[PDB]
Write a protein that binds this ligand. Sequence first.
Ligand SMILES: CCc1noc2cc(OC)c(NS(=O)(=O)c3ccc(OC)cc3)cc12
Length: 131
Amino acid sequence: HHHLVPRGSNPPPPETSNPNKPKRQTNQLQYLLRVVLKTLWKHQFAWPFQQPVDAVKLNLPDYYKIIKTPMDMGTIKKRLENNYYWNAQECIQDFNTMFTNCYIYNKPGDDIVLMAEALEKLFLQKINELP
Ligand SMILES: CCc1noc2cc(OC)c(NS(=O)(=O)c3ccc(OC)cc3)cc12
């Protein structure tokens, strides 16, 4: 037997659709999609953040022991395209949670943290210029 099974796995990803959740369109939300997310999405440091962390594929079996509120721009992007949010604040907080998770899990000076820092800086610039 020797506990070679059951195996590890990834959690279910964060929801991208919730029919009973209040939602609306606001000019701020439209710009977070049109401008903010879309310019981040194509940055060369975007690729680790474009989908939920695959702990299996990436050999990070500890990831979901440490990170309990996962978040990624793939999820944020779908939430925006689905009009899932009530205000800009909810969307921004997802972005914050994503950056914060990366800082929590890794060490300062790790390459991944430098990737997040760069995106976060760019994020914050684009954020200053909100309607
Ligand atoms: C948000 C995704 C993420 N957060 O912390 C990570 C750590 C990673 O490997 C150490 C990896 N693995 S990786 O293969 O995507 C990766 C990315 C960058 C890196 O340094 C440049 C090393 C591994 C991903 C993450």
